[PDB]
Tab-separated table of C-alpha atoms in Angstrom:
chain	number	residue	atom	x	y	z
B	1	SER	CA	73.076	124.881	114.287
B	2	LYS	CA	72.943	123.265	117.795
B	3	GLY	CA	72.357	120.160	117.149
B	4	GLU	CA	75.935	119.013	118.678
B	5	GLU	CA	74.707	120.083	122.185
B	6	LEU	CA	72.131	116.823	121.967
B	7	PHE	CA	75.870	114.989	122.283
B	8	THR	CA	76.850	116.463	125.661
B	9	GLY	CA	76.482	113.370	127.465
B	10	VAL	CA	75.107	109.649	126.716
B	11	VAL	CA	72.847	108.747	124.488
B	12	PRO	CA	70.352	105.900	123.783
B	13	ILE	CA	70.635	104.064	120.533
B	14	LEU	CA	68.450	101.913	118.803
B	15	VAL	CA	69.210	100.001	115.328
B	16	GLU	CA	67.348	98.429	112.797
B	17	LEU	CA	68.022	96.709	109.931
B	18	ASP	CA	65.736	94.932	107.100
B	19	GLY	CA	68.647	92.798	104.888
B	20	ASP	CA	67.851	91.473	101.537
B	21	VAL	CA	70.515	89.483	100.529
B	22	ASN	CA	70.686	87.221	96.710
B	23	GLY	CA	66.812	86.464	98.605
B	24	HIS	CA	68.405	85.768	101.657
B	25	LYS	CA	66.193	88.449	104.059
B	26	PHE	CA	66.841	88.830	107.534
B	27	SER	CA	66.691	91.356	110.378
B	28	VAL	CA	68.906	92.838	112.878
B	29	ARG	CA	68.330	95.063	115.885
B	30	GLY	CA	70.606	96.481	118.491
B	31	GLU	CA	70.901	98.687	121.109
B	32	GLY	CA	73.544	100.340	123.689
B	33	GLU	CA	74.584	104.224	123.801
B	34	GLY	CA	76.741	106.560	122.417
B	35	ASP	CA	79.159	109.166	124.602
B	36	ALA	CA	80.923	111.749	121.703
B	37	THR	CA	82.244	113.260	124.165
B	38	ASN	CA	84.833	110.317	123.898
B	39	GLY	CA	83.969	108.951	120.874
B	40	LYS	CA	82.984	105.676	122.041
B	41	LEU	CA	79.615	103.800	120.462
B	42	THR	CA	79.049	100.378	122.776
B	43	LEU	CA	76.587	98.307	121.331
B	44	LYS	CA	74.872	94.416	121.155
B	45	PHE	CA	73.263	93.398	118.129
B	46	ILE	CA	70.782	90.836	117.326
B	47	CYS	CA	69.670	88.138	114.342
B	48	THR	CA	65.892	88.583	114.712
B	49	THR	CA	64.941	86.439	112.160
B	50	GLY	CA	67.431	83.480	113.706
B	51	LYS	CA	70.563	83.377	111.418
B	52	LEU	CA	72.328	85.946	109.765
B	53	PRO	CA	73.463	84.626	106.512
B	54	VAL	CA	76.507	86.999	106.002
B	55	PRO	CA	78.870	87.369	108.289
B	56	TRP	CA	78.778	90.190	111.307
B	57	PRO	CA	81.685	91.873	109.722
B	58	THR	CA	80.469	93.233	107.060
B	59	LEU	CA	77.546	94.534	108.671
B	60	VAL	CA	79.772	96.852	110.880
B	61	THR	CA	79.458	99.977	108.782
B	62	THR	CA	76.359	99.512	107.887
B	63	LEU	CA	75.136	99.212	111.453
B	64	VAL	CA	76.361	106.191	113.648
B	65	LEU	CA	79.028	108.840	113.094
B	66	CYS	CA	77.314	111.502	114.709
B	67	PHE	CA	79.272	110.047	118.119
B	68	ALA	CA	82.435	111.083	116.564
B	69	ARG	CA	84.616	112.922	118.778
B	70	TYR	CA	85.672	116.013	116.893
B	71	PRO	CA	88.141	118.286	118.781
B	72	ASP	CA	87.366	121.228	119.477
B	73	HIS	CA	89.592	122.967	116.989
B	74	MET	CA	87.538	120.745	114.547
B	75	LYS	CA	83.876	121.143	115.824
B	76	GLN	CA	83.131	123.454	112.724
B	77	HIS	CA	83.545	120.315	110.421
B	78	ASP	CA	80.679	118.158	112.451
B	79	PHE	CA	78.270	118.129	109.961
B	80	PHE	CA	76.552	114.657	111.244
B	81	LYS	CA	75.622	116.702	114.369
B	82	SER	CA	74.996	119.757	112.746
B	83	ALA	CA	71.805	118.279	111.196
B	84	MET	CA	70.198	116.754	114.041
B	85	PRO	CA	67.773	115.939	115.763
B	86	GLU	CA	65.994	115.982	112.529
B	87	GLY	CA	68.750	113.901	111.130
B	88	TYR	CA	70.403	112.844	108.069
B	89	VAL	CA	70.503	110.191	105.362
B	90	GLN	CA	73.012	107.677	104.885
B	91	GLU	CA	73.675	106.306	101.696
B	92	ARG	CA	76.213	103.516	100.623
B	93	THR	CA	77.052	101.274	98.019
B	94	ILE	CA	79.233	98.680	99.009
B	95	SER	CA	81.692	96.627	96.752
B	96	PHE	CA	82.668	93.448	97.268
B	97	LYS	CA	85.771	92.702	95.032
B	98	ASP	CA	85.141	89.499	92.981
B	99	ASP	CA	81.686	89.274	94.441
B	100	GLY	CA	78.139	90.947	94.764
B	101	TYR	CA	77.280	94.375	96.148
B	102	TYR	CA	75.348	96.190	99.147
B	103	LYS	CA	73.085	99.084	98.864
B	104	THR	CA	72.089	100.325	101.880
B	105	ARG	CA	69.381	103.532	102.616
B	106	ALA	CA	69.661	104.673	106.277
B	107	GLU	CA	67.613	107.660	108.187
B	108	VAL	CA	69.707	108.569	111.676
B	109	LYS	CA	68.125	111.297	113.712
B	110	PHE	CA	66.308	111.355	117.471
B	111	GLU	CA	63.057	110.019	117.847
B	112	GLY	CA	61.996	110.944	121.408
B	113	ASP	CA	65.760	110.439	123.272
B	114	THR	CA	67.209	108.320	121.497
B	115	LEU	CA	69.331	108.132	118.758
B	116	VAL	CA	67.729	105.938	115.910
B	117	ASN	CA	69.679	104.179	112.999
B	118	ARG	CA	66.934	102.167	110.742
B	119	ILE	CA	68.502	100.562	107.705
B	120	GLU	CA	67.406	99.067	104.447
B	121	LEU	CA	70.026	96.842	102.857
B	122	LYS	CA	69.197	95.022	99.158
B	123	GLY	CA	72.446	92.806	98.367
B	124	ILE	CA	72.675	91.759	94.870
B	125	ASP	CA	75.069	89.340	92.983
B	126	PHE	CA	76.913	87.440	95.720
B	127	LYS	CA	77.935	84.508	95.474
B	128	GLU	CA	76.700	81.190	97.601
B	129	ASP	CA	79.775	80.087	98.013
B	130	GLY	CA	82.088	83.150	98.215
B	131	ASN	CA	83.687	84.710	101.430
B	132	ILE	CA	80.483	86.533	102.190
B	133	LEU	CA	77.337	84.059	101.671
B	134	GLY	CA	79.903	81.307	101.838
B	135	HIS	CA	81.101	82.184	105.690
B	136	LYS	CA	84.792	82.914	105.586
B	137	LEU	CA	85.820	86.263	107.204
B	138	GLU	CA	87.599	86.541	110.630
B	139	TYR	CA	85.004	87.481	113.710
B	140	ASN	CA	86.689	90.895	113.716
B	141	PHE	CA	87.658	94.837	111.870
B	142	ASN	CA	90.200	96.612	111.411
B	143	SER	CA	91.080	100.207	112.083
B	144	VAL	CA	90.875	102.589	109.038
B	145	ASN	CA	91.056	106.721	108.805
B	146	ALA	CA	88.216	107.439	106.227
B	147	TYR	CA	87.732	110.347	104.344
B	148	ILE	CA	85.048	112.867	104.154
B	149	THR	CA	84.761	115.601	101.742
B	150	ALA	CA	81.917	118.203	101.257
B	151	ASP	CA	79.066	117.477	98.596
B	152	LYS	CA	77.941	121.098	98.204
B	153	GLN	CA	75.939	120.332	95.741
B	154	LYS	CA	73.570	117.907	98.006
B	155	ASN	CA	73.999	120.135	100.970
B	156	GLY	CA	75.973	117.257	102.509
B	157	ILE	CA	79.364	115.246	102.638
B	158	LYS	CA	80.360	112.204	100.792
B	159	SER	CA	82.951	109.664	101.230
B	160	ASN	CA	84.847	106.338	100.440
B	161	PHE	CA	87.019	104.379	101.891
B	162	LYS	CA	88.190	100.770	101.741
B	163	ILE	CA	87.750	98.174	103.848
B	164	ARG	CA	89.281	95.161	104.304
B	165	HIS	CA	87.973	91.861	105.399
B	166	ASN	CA	90.353	89.100	106.781
B	167	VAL	CA	89.392	86.240	105.252
B	168	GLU	CA	89.792	82.474	107.038
B	169	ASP	CA	92.480	81.563	104.094
B	170	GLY	CA	94.999	84.477	105.379
B	171	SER	CA	93.893	86.743	101.774
B	172	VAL	CA	91.786	89.717	102.001
B	173	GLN	CA	88.660	91.048	101.121
B	174	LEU	CA	88.188	94.078	99.688
B	175	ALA	CA	84.684	95.866	100.741
B	176	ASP	CA	85.005	99.237	98.670
B	177	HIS	CA	82.853	101.973	100.148
B	178	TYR	CA	81.311	104.658	98.431
B	179	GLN	CA	78.911	106.812	101.160
B	180	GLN	CA	76.757	109.917	100.557
B	181	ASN	CA	74.855	111.562	103.814
B	182	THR	CA	72.067	114.824	102.724
B	183	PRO	CA	70.057	116.411	105.821
B	184	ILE	CA	66.447	115.520	106.481
B	185	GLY	CA	65.437	118.895	107.728
B	186	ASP	CA	66.006	122.463	106.002
B	187	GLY	CA	68.031	123.533	108.621
B	188	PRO	CA	71.525	124.656	108.891
B	189	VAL	CA	74.502	122.434	107.983
B	190	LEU	CA	77.961	122.689	108.396
B	191	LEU	CA	79.699	121.758	105.593
B	192	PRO	CA	83.812	120.499	106.777
B	193	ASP	CA	86.588	121.378	105.059
B	194	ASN	CA	88.683	117.655	103.900
B	195	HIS	CA	88.970	116.038	107.032
B	196	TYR	CA	88.763	112.603	107.980
B	197	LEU	CA	87.254	109.933	110.787
B	198	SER	CA	89.831	107.279	112.586
B	199	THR	CA	88.010	103.906	113.507
B	200	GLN	CA	88.922	101.530	115.698
B	201	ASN	CA	86.205	98.588	116.514
B	202	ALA	CA	86.207	95.477	118.515
B	203	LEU	CA	84.034	92.916	118.366
B	204	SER	CA	82.560	90.241	121.102
B	205	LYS	CA	80.041	87.626	122.007
B	206	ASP	CA	78.131	87.798	124.982
B	207	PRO	CA	78.372	84.363	127.112
B	208	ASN	CA	74.857	84.232	128.201
B	209	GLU	CA	73.293	84.953	124.862
B	210	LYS	CA	72.216	81.994	122.677
B	211	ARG	CA	70.796	84.007	119.233
B	212	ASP	CA	73.050	85.027	116.411
B	213	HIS	CA	74.658	88.212	117.720
B	214	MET	CA	78.112	91.289	117.888
B	215	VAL	CA	78.612	92.707	120.425
B	216	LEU	CA	80.901	95.175	119.660
B	217	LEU	CA	82.953	98.586	120.838
B	218	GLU	CA	84.303	101.085	118.668
B	219	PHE	CA	85.610	104.803	119.062
B	220	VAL	CA	85.267	107.138	115.849
B	221	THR	CA	87.587	110.785	116.274
B	222	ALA	CA	88.090	113.161	113.800
B	223	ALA	CA	91.227	114.228	112.502
B	224	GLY	CA	93.350	115.730	109.386
B	225	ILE	CA	92.851	119.661	110.272
B	226	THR	CA	95.718	121.679	111.384
B	227	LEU	CA	96.687	122.935	114.999
B	228	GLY	CA	94.545	122.278	118.038
B	229	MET	CA	95.204	122.630	122.058
B	230	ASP	CA	99.498	121.699	121.805
């Protein structure tokens, strides 16, 4: 596959999300750019339907792993870029412990010059006074290593990892993530060996923005495979 050659520069990004959590409907639109050479994403997200009915941090994982920085000695394990430009489907179940769950289905693929992440999210069985629908989570996002394994019986990859959201009262809300990715096209894809993505996030606000929004800076770097340019 040649897909990785589409990410050697800076690539504009468009993210569109339609959400429905316990019948609370919402939409989010994000725009920015990705720089896979550095593993860097810079995006600004707007709730275009007004008030976001869930905390912005609970949407970070849902709102483009093709922008991870794979070190040279690991380029053969980069499933995400290998599927491009046709893209992949990314599906998750995110189970909030002692609370509801998200089910997400996204298509990550190039539309023209732009990498687009288009997502359908349904949230079910949440508590209306819980940490999610109650907006009890701090506006931040801790750093995380998320392990990838190949899924040969689906021609894709899978991953499960735990996101720990800080609660305003000092407790921690667990979001257990189960993820599946499978290509859209029929071309060749890279099935990686076991490894992980190391991710850091900085969440902020745009002073001149009145809408409900999230400014996001994110770094994603692949690791977990031995040797590589001492």
